[PDB]
Amino acid sequence: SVEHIPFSHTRYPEQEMRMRSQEFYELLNKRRSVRFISSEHVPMEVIENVIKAAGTAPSGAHTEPWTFVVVKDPDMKHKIREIIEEEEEINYMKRMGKRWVTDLKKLRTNWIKEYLDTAPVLILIFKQVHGFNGKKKVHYYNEISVSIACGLLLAALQNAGLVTVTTTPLNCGPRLRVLLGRPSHEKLLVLLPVGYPSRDATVPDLKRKALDQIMVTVH
Amino acid sequence: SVEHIPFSHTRYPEQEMRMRSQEFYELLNKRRSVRFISSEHVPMEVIENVIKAAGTAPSGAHTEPWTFVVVKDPDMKHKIREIIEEEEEINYMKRMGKRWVTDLKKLRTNWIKEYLDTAPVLILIFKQVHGFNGKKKVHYYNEISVSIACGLLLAALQNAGLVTVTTTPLNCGPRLRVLLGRPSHEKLLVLLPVGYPSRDATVPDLKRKALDQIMVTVHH
Numbered sequence: 298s299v300e301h302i303p304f305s306h307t308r309y310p311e312q313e314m315r316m317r318s319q320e321f322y323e324l325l326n327k328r329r330s331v332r333f334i335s336s337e338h339v340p341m342e343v344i345e346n347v348i349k350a351a352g353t354a355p356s357g358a359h360t361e362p363w364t365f366v367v368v369k370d371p372d373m374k375h376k377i378r379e380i381i382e383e384e385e386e387i388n389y390m391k392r393m394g395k396r397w398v399t400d401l402k403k404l405r406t407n408w409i410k411e412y413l414d415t416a417p418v419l420i421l422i423f424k425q426v427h428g429f430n431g432k433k434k435v436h437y438y439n440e441i442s443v444s445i446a447c448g449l450l451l452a453a454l455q456n457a458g459l460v461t462v463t464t465t466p467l468n469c470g471p472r473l474r475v476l477l478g479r480p481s482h483e484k485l486l487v488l489l490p491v492g493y494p495s496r497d498a499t500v501p502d503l504k505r506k507a508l509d510q511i512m513v514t515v516h
Numbered sequence: 517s518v519e520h521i522p523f524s525h526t527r528y529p530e531q532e533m534r535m536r537s538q539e540f541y542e543l544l545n546k547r548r549s550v551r552f553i554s555s556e557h558v559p560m561e562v563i564e565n566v567i568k569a570a571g572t573a574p575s576g577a578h579t580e581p582w583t584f585v586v587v588k589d590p591d592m593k594h595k596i597r598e599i600i601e602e603e604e605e606i607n608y609m610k611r612m613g614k615r616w617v618t619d620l621k622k623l624r625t626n627w628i629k630e631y632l633d634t635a636p637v638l639i640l641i642f643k644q645v646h647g648f649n650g651k652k653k654v655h656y657y658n659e660i661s662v663s664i665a666c667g668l669l670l671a672a673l674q675n676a677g678l679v680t681v682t683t684t685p686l687n688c689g690p691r692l693r694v695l696l697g698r699p700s701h702e703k704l705l706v707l708l709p710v711g712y713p714s715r716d717a718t719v720p721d722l723k724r725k726a727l728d729q730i731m732v733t734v735h736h
């Protein structure tokens with residue numbers, strides 16, 4: 298359809314590549330899902346920059362099938378909280394099933410989500426399951442694409458000194474999509490409450506796998 | 517459970533938060549999918565650090581359901597290449613369909629994947645659709661979790677001065693999984709050829725949406 302151009306690349310010496318990759322790992326490794334979020338204001342320009350970063354993600358056939366919905370208004374944050382707490386309660390009681398509920402004991406999560414009120418910003422990431430002269434276009438691998446962008450967003454948040462927890466509000470998508478005025482070709486993928494951690498924020502003492510438990514070399 | 521411990525955090529002043537996030541956006545915005553990789557060797561230590569970076573991703577219920585399989589052997593890379601080209605060729609002539617094939621024209625991709633040979637490293641990312649001491653265990657949102665890890669990997673590669681292209685070799689999963697001796701609960705998500713760009717690498721002249729085409733602020 299259009300032209301191709303030389304690729305321009307920044308090369309670092311090997312030593313600098315080691316040190317950069319090291320320190321980026323160290324930076325990302327300090328990231329934890331934080332479920333206790335201060336209501337201190339965050340600068341909107343930072344939120345913008347992290348969403349711009351997420352928007353640099355690759356996507357199947359260059360479709361960029363993502364919408365980041367940002368909610369700061371307290372009335373609206375609280376309506377989102379009412380929906381999530383209602384749905385999550387049924388999820389814990391009924392829909393998740395015993396094994397799932399057991400697998401979550403160690404996180405001490407339940408259906409009470411105070412962070413939906415207290416966090417200064419909520420970011421709801423919607424995938425566009427298809428797109429749109431005004432003709433209908435395929436979104437190839439939209440879920441994976443949008444999840445890659447989420448990864449970039451998480452990295453950008455960590456790099457900027459903000460915290461969050463990646464949530465899936467199971468069975469809340471349609472209610473939240475309707476509430477937020479999103480079109481029917483958007484689904485909710487993930488909800489991220491963003492801000493500074495609370496002073497007494499806590500995290501579960503989880504450990505990550507060692508390198509040789511995640512990387513395999515062949516042949 | 518699993519005890520719960522205090523969390524702490526490095527905080528930057530607002531002005532540094534702006535700067536850091538501005539800079540990080542510019543760094544990431546320079547990432548392009550590059551389909552012409554140099555055969556020059558890359559430091560294994562960097563490969564490790566990017567994979568470790570990927571391993572810091574959140575995952576549903578702390579399942580860490582990812583395996584990064586790292587191929588450097590010329591014979592194995594070539595076998596990978598044989599499977600993917602044979603399978604992509606059918607994908608282009610018949611399995612994707614006219615519309616998909618049309619949507620790829622602007623990228624000028626075809627079934628020939630010389631990077632599978634020339635790249636010094638391939639990373640194949642497998643999701644673990646469930647896991648196991650010995651008892652079976654349930655990997656919630658494994659696909660999204662591994663794709664988030666992919667996002668971190670891609671960031672880590674850009675940050676490290678390496679390039680790649682995120683690929684999905686349609687209908688190659690089962691043959692790759694078997695070729696690489698991966699167990700039957702692993703399933704290929706994406707393949708990343710890694711290295712420096714060829715001296716004459718080109719990319720399509722694509723534009724990304726402006727901020728107001730991807731970000732919506734909603735109130736009452």
Ligand SMILES: Cc1cc2nc3c(=O)[nH]c(=O)nc-3n(C[C@H](O)[C@H](O)[C@H](O)COP(=O)(O)O)c2cc1C
Nearest residue numbers: 355356357358359438441442548549625682683684
């Ligand atoms: C999930 C998904 C699948 C992709 N599959 C292929 C592919 O199979 N072959 C390929 O050459 N590029 C593939 N790509 C890369 C996209 O075509 C590329 O990201 C897009 O054209 C935008 O280019 P950019 O990454 O430089 O921003 C894929 C990307 C995504 C995220």
Ligand SMILES: Cc1cc2nc3c(=O)[nH]c(=O)nc-3n(C[C@H](O)[C@H](O)[C@H](O)COP(=O)(O)O)c2cc1C
Nearest residue numbers: 329330463464465466574575576577578657660661
């Ligand atoms: C796709 C996926 C879904 C997740 N869903 C939820 C969720 O609904 N609620 C929640 O509190 N955390 C969720 N998380 C956080 C995890 O429970 C998990 O323990 C955390 O990601 C692992 O700890 P860490 O992020 O601090 O490394 C999710 C993570 C992934 C990526």
Ligand SMILES: N[C@@H](Cc1ccc(O)c(I)c1)C(=O)O
Nearest residue numbers: 357358359437625626684685
């Ligand atoms: N997997 C094929 C086709 C392809 C290419 C680019 C792209 O964004 C997508 I979605 C598919 C290939 O590698 O050519």
Ligand SMILES: N[C@@H](Cc1ccc(O)c(I)c1)C(=O)O
Nearest residue numbers: 406407465467576577578656
């Ligand atoms: N969505 C529910 C339950 C939950 C919690 C953590 C987690 O990793 C997963 I997968 C699910 C909630 O937010 O509590």
